[PDB]
């Protein structure tokens, strides 16, 4: 994994002092420094004819070097990137909100990559306009066939800030079945931050626990998506990585985590508010956990 402790890991107390020294504007300027690094890689596949219409946004391509390729195809392209996590290669697949013409690519990827958990941090529509297609059967007994993959809704639970849907994917060619858990987090708008650090952190543990549970019943990546799959996606994953290192080693480094992530899912973390939120969420967590 690219996410290893070295070489400037900070303790929680050093983090407090760091954020205090820099303040919000210092943190915002730190995000700008990140933004300025020239991306390591290229975007040719994303920009090819045939693939252009498979991108939700003209300004959010994906890296050639880390993209998830579709094997059982009409191209091998989906706007989706393999992302390392804390001491774990390919812990996530970061991807855009599926389009009607990419629903079947999305499910092929989920099948092919043995995905057990999907994390969605967007509503279908936010502030008037379309953000993500309805790519899964919304109601309990509904099904949708995507070629040889049939997806059936087995039940929906509503929670304070997210909904948990259990799906069965039935590959009717191979005659195999797998359950996948779909989590939709509802209170995190594009371009913004969640209404509460605590709700997102609770949400993260729920997701973690489901992934661990699923894996024991069988490591596959967790699919994490938003609309573009860079802003909220990068923030979610970056927080996950930092909290994991904090738990295990009592250290972290936000700048390093985000910089590294952007070499894998290009453009991860889309605003300085999101970047600052990562530091703030970690510190709020620390305080509530008594490292304050």
């Amino acid at each position: 994994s690219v996410h290893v402790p070295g070489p400037h890991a900070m303790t929680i107390q050093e983090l407090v002092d760091y954020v205090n020294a820099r303040q919000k504007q210092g943190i915002y300027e730190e995000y700008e420094d990140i933004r300025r690094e020239n991306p390591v890689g290229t975007f040719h596949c994303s920009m090819s004819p045939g693939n252009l219409e498979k991108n939700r946004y003209g300004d959010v391509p994906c890296l050639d070097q880390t993209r998830v390729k579709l094997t059982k195809r009409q191209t091998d392209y989906i706007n989706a990137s393999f992302m390392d996590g804390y001491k774990q290669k390919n812990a996530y697949i970061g991807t855009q909100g599926p389009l009607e013409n990419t629903y079947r690519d999305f499910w092929l990827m989920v099948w092919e990559q043995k995905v057990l958990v999907i994390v969605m941090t967007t509503r279908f529509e936010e502030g008037g306009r379309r953000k993500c297609g309805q790519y899964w059967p919304l109601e309990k007994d509904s099904r949708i066939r995507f070629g040889f993959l049939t997806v059936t809704n087995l039940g929906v639970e509503n929670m304070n800030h997210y909904k948990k849907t259990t799906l069965e994917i039935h590959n009717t060619e191979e005659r195999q079945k797998r359950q996948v858990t779909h989590f939709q987090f509802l209170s995190w708008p594009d371009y913004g931050v969640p209404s509460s650090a605590a709700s997102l952190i609770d949400f993260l543990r729920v997701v973690r626990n489901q992934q661990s549970l699923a894996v024991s019943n069988m490591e596959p990546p967790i699919v994490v998506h938003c609309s573009a799959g860079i802003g909220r996606t990068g923030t979610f994953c970056s927080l996950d990585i930092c909290l994991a290192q904090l738990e295990e080693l009592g250290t972290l480094n936000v700048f390093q985590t985000v910089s590294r992530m952007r070499t894998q899912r290009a453009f991860s973390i889309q605003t300085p508010e999101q970047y600052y939120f990562c530091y703030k969420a970690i510190l709020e967590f620390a305080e509530k956990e008594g490292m304050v």
């Binding site: 939700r56 946004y57 300004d59 306009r129 953000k131 609309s227 860079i230 889309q270």
Partner: peptide
């Protein structure tokens, strides 16, 4: 959508 930014 058509541009994210």
């Amino acid at each position: 959508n058509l541009y994210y930014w």
